[PDB]
Design a binder for this molecule. Structure first.
Ligand SMILES: O=C(O)Cc1cc(I)c(Oc2cc(I)c(O)c(I)c2)c(I)c1
Length: 258
């Protein structure tokens, strides 16, 4: 029924979507256009081997990773902006906020990375490039296996055929996780998330007539994520210990260590 309570939920869906569009330049809608040749906007350069990598650019493995950590950080900005737009979020203790975002960003990042991914590879540099999945593998060990798990996550996640409107609400649901280590006011965070979770369930029901237990099937991805993120850190521990010669951006090093 279209009661006042649902109306308010739909308002919450719309606010969140509008904020997401303002904070997130490359939306999934834009990405998929590019990826399907539907766009008439400039086609991206395709890094599929060493040659095309060098021509696109106008050690390798290390360069790519150091470029990704620069995006890894611009992303964390984007995210932070959006998180602040979530109703209730700023009216939380500033030390709960920093916590939710410390433990949350990476989940969001890999959620949204999936928007830029197909079977073949990933869009990069805000739509201007595309790096092939097989190429990111062919990177020398241990750098050959840091994305593979994200591509594995992405192909399953993308099967759900979530749109930007869905992902808006879902990303909020994650950020307001009521079980991050070192949370003072847990009751408020859970109270907002309850509200978001109602919003998301209703959004999904409306937007996905074909597919039941999607809401279910989505929340299960929250788990796949936390796993991916763990395994990513464990690799970063190995890399940091293998290649104690390169430099790891200090802001990531604050997040990763806890
Ligand atoms: O966690 C990790 O494995 C590291 C990582 C993080 C991001 I974020 C990536 O995705 C992008 C998206 C855009 I847009 C870019 O411009 C670039 I460079 C990388 C990739 I690949 C790898």
């Amino acid at each position: 029924q279209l009661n006042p309570e649902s109306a308010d939920l739909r308002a919450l869906a719309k606010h969140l979507y509008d904020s997401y569009i303002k904070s997130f330049p490359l939306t999934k809608a834009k990405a998929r256009a590019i990826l399907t040749g539907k766009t008439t906007d400039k086609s991206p350069f395709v890094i599929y081997d060493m040659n095309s990598l060098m021509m696109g650019e106008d050690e390798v493995a290390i360069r790519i990773f150091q470029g990704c950590q620069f995006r890894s950080v611009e992303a964390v900005q984007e995210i932070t902006e959006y998180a602040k737009s979530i109703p209730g979020f700023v009216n939380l203790d500033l030390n709960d906020q920093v916590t939710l975002l410390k433990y949350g960003v990476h989940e969001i990042i890999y959620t949204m990375l999936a928007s830029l991914m197909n079977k073949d590879g990933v869009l990069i540099s805000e739509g201007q490039g595309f790096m092939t999945r097989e190429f990111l593998k062919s990177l020398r060990k241990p750098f050959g296996d840091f994305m593979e798990p994200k591509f594995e996550f992405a192909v399953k996640f993308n099967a759900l055929e979530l749109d930007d409107s869905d992902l808006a609400i879902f990303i909020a649901v994650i950020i307001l996780s009521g079980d991050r280590p070192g949370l003072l006011n847990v009751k408020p965070i859970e109270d907002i998330q309850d509200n978001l979770l109602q919003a998301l369930e209703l959004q999904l029901k409306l937007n996905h007539p074909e597919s039941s237990q999607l809401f279910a099937k989505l929340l299960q991805k929250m788990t796949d994520l936390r796993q991916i993120v763990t395994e990513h850190v464990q690799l970063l521990q190995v890399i940091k210990k293998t290649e104690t010669d390169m430099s790891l951006h200090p802001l990531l090093q604050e997040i990763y260590k806890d």
